[PDB]
Structure 1
């Protein structure tokens, strides 16, 4: 008989501990694995695939239309859309990125925001996208917007433009749930010159917008998502 002493914590059950256990089914042989395409190893692998952002959130019931950012022909100087960058809330929240970020407490890294244009091929347009780093207000006019991170996008044969929100930060991690100290800025978009439709054409054209994370990205300290809950256990 070897002398032992038990410490504080004996008998506790910590849902996060990782130890060995007896197998209830001694000697059982599991089914062989066969090959299946698509294996995922890290959630970091999947948040780099871009998905659509319901940017046009202004509706009243969920609709395919809140994915469409409208553009008006012949407007000059004006603003196309605006949003803050609380990736865990608001427009971002239902996107795959938003949806995964919510399983973690802290995030750090660059984001990739792209816009794909869908107007007739014989039209043309020049837009400016601007990222405003924390510390200033959402820009109120392009002059204000153009003094921060921006890209003049020229609509052409190449249909999409990929803007990166480079990680601009004092503190090396921000909270995924919206926090002030930890806030990330604003994203706005304005006409640089203006949309022009060809003859025989009319109305609004739309941009689709996507979001995905750069390879830069870090997420840490897992927790429970506000995105799902329940009141009684389900049954069959």
Structure 2
């Protein structure tokens, strides 16, 4: 007769507890494993793959056009696009990164922002991508943007530029929650030179934007996402 004393919390059901339990099917032999391609071990692996950002979210309904960033010919200092860096909201909410980030409460690390040109091969352009750390609002002109982290991109044989959004923060982790006071900062693109279209070509050309996490990315405290809901249980 071993003397015992049950502690507070005895008999509770903590959905997060990790204990052993009796098997309802003793001696059962599960089907053997076969080799299946594409094994995933960690969610940090898959967020390193970039997905398209619906940067042009100015439409009344969801469309392919939401992913197309317009580029106009013969314009000098103007802005191409802009966005705050709340990775749990805005244009990022529906991306793979944004979706996985929403399952966690804290984040940290650097982001990978890519831009792919889709205009004619005989066209040219130079753009300046800028990342503005928090403290000063979003840049209102190229001169303001150029003062922060930036990359001058020359469109050529290599169609994609990969700008990085370096982890620039005092506190070592940030909240995934968009209802917070401040985020990673701002992102903007400006005409460094201008888009020059070749003869016999007219109209707008487009940029495609991508987002992914660098190998230094961190995610903590699992939580439920606000991207899915239901009012009644589903039936067959």
TM over 0.5: yes
Q: CA deviation at 1:177?
A: 1.1
115-124 or 177-186, larger mean C-alpha shift: 177-186
Task: Note the alpha carbon deviations across 1:5-44, whole angstroms, 9 max, x for none.
Answer: 1111000000000011100000000000100000000000
Q: CA deviation at 1:180?
A: 4.2
What is the TM-score with the length of structure 1 in the denominator?
A: 0.99
214-223 or 178-187, larger mean C-alpha shift: 178-187
Alpha-carbon separation, structure 1, partners of 2:192 and 2:134: 24
Alpha-carbon separation, structure 1, partners of 2:227 and 2:54: 16
Which residue pairs with 2:85 in the alignment?
A: 85
Q: Mark the runs of 5 or more structure 2 residues left unpaired by the alignment.
A: none
Task: Note the alpha carbon deviations across 1:102-150, whole angstroms, 9 max, x for none.
Answer: 0000000000001000000000000000000011100000000000000
Q: Mark the runs of 5 or more structure 1 residues left unpaired by the alignment.
A: none
Alpha-carbon separation, structure 2, partners of 1:76 and 1:183: 30
182-191 or 56-65, larger mean C-alpha shift: 182-191
The RMSD of aligned alpha carbons is: 0.7
What is the TM-score with the length of structure 2 in the denominator?
A: 0.99
Q: CA deviation at 1:181?
A: 4.8
Which residue pairs with 1:173 in the alignment?
A: 173
Alpha-carbon separation, structure 2, partners of 1:140 and 1:180: 23
- The runs of at least 4 consecutive aligned structure 1 residues that moved more than 4 Å come to 179-182
Q: CA deviation at 1:71?
A: 0.3
Matched, 1:130 2:148: no
Alpha-carbon separation, structure 2, partners of 1:59 and 1:178: 22
